[PDB]
Amino acid sequence: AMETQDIIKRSATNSITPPSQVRDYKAEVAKLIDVSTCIGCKACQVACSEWNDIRDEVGHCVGVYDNPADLSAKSWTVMRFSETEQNGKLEWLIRKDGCMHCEDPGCLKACPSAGAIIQYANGIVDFQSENCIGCGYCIAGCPFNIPRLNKEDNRVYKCTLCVDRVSVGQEPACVKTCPTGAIHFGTKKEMLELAEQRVAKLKARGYEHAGVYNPEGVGGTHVMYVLHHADQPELYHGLPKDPKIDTSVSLWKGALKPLAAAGFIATFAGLIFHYIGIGPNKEVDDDEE
């Protein structure tokens, strides 16, 4: 582990023993999904599974185009479809879903196994499966409900941002395949610029609330969206408005630990100093004199 020496965050690792990260002078990368150019073709689902050597099961049709119906250990990205008349006319809002590669990942923060989840200097958050114990804490820590357990090996999997292509200079498989160029990839700095140009053209077409989805609650994401209705992200099949790491998770993984530590140390001191100070409680301390 740590061969790349650019590991900026590592699950379940004390803050005074940080992971190897001397080679951290690298630009942050990012995927930009412009849902206003998406045609819901599912090419990205296909390219992702082909590249990653995974195949989900042949499922069922239950009344919608969406399929598979959810992310899974064998489906790292899925198209989510929404039909709505909330904005005054019929609209078909289609959004690619999958890991957001958060700057401050909740999966990593909730994980109790050292090295199971890491964050590279370029922004990719990836699972190091040799260390995963199958507890599922990351599923609850994630604000986006991303991690999925594989029943065949008790480990969680998700979109890796094609770390195996990006690490050697190539863009991810779904980015390259996208028919309409709804998906773009590059440095984060230039994807934020493309995002702002696209927002400007959407406003010029009448979408006064177009915007970039790059949530500040998680420190910004390396997978960002351009949304026609950025004031109403929940219209896009439940994308969270102002996501953040849950307060209960923050307190559980944060202050509870040192507090418990102090209790335990203090308790041990007290009991030890108590036994020594007062001495045993035997049947007769009195016929000892």
Binding site: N14, I16, I272, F273, I276, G277, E289
Partner: protein, 216 residues
């Protein structure tokens, strides 16, 4: 002479002593993990090897502070005198459990005083060489050659002190009734008579005499 026990050690010196012992277990075990890397399990003495490297020296400093409190409270009772010679000459006899027959034993015997100075000297050596080899805080101010000699001497002093404490714990387990005195503070008069004659004679006189001095 009408009490099952006599106080040998005050609570303050008992609290300190068991603080030192707990700190010493962590420091000696972490030290041994760097000295013998084949004993991998000891690299988890402070949780992880990375953590152990950080905490060893801090717990080391705490031991030295507490041993300096012990130094000023026990040194006067550990002073070598001409009466200790007898001990030093019938060591073989003492080890067979016959020391009373061969020597004059006050508060602490001649072995215990040798240990005391050994322990006190080594912790001073360990403190000085420890500071010198401590990264990141202090090793940078020392000439490389002094750091290298300090690495050699600290390793050797730490091994000598561990041996010493192994023998110190053994003796405390061997001269029965001793651990209870260090935990509870009291020793039975007969223990006093057998292992530390002159000592108990003094308490007994100090005792009786000052109560006789009152004017019953």
């Amino acid at each position: 002479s009408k009490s099952k026990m006599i106080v040998r050690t005050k609570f303050i010196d008992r609290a300190c002593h068991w603080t030192v012992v707990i700190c010493f277990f962590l420091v000696a075990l972490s030290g041994i993990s760097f000295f013998f890397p084949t004993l991998q399990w000891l690299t988890q003495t402070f949780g992880t090897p990375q953590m152990g490297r950080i905490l060893h020296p801090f717990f080391g400093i705490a031991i030295f502070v507490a041993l300096m409190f012990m130094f000023v409270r026990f040194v006067h009772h550990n002073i070598p005198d001409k009466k200790d010679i007898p001990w030093l000459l019938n060591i073989v006899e003492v080890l067979k459990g016959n020391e009373h027959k061969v020597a004059d034993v006050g508060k602490y015997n001649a072995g215990q005083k040798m240990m005391f100075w050994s322990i006190m000297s080594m912790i001073f050596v360990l403190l000085v060489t420890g500071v010198i080899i401590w990264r990141p805080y202090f090793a940078q101010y020392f000439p490389m050659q002094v750091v290298r000699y300090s690495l050699l001497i600290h390793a050797a002093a730490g091994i000598i002190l561990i041996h010493a404490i192994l023998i110190h714990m053994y003796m405390a387990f061997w001269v029965k009734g001793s651990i209870k005195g260090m935990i509870e503070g009291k020793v039975s008069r007969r223990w006093a008579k057998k292992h530390h004659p002159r000592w108990y004679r003094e308490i007994e006189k100090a005792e009786a005499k000052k109560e006789s001095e009152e004017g019953i």
